[PDB]
């Protein structure tokens, strides 16, 4: 999948972002992270992006995780 | 891609949304909807999902799913 020209100001808020924030996967609107436990990954990181220090961790093509704290 | 067995345990909360609560693309987890004027599509509706009354309608220049914004239908 190719990306858009980024125009930020299409972009919908994120809220507050309890875990911080990142980019989307095509580095352009601000996305709030998943946190511990919470779903992650799929096409584009659809289903969540784990915080810094968290991995994510397929569920026991693009994997499907949980976020779980690296060790 | 083919979706996971839905488990709401491991959704996280959405926060409250501007444009009302959905599911997301493999009718698990609560999302918020985008609203008009909004990035829309993708993957698995990762740039957004339109809010009732709105539809995703592709970006200029787009060709052959589609990014796009939400704008109001007949």
């Given at each position: 999948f190719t990306c858009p020209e980024?125009?930020?100001?299409?972009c919908g808020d994120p809220g507050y972002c309890e875990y911080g924030t990142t980019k989307d996967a095509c580095d352009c609107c601000p996305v709030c992270f998943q946190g511990p436990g919470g779903y992650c990954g799929g096409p584009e990181d659809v289903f969540g992006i784990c915080a810094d220090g968290f991995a994510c961790v397929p569920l026991v093509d693009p994997i499907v995780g949980t976020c779980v704290k690296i060790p």
């Open positions: 980024c125009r930020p100001e299409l």
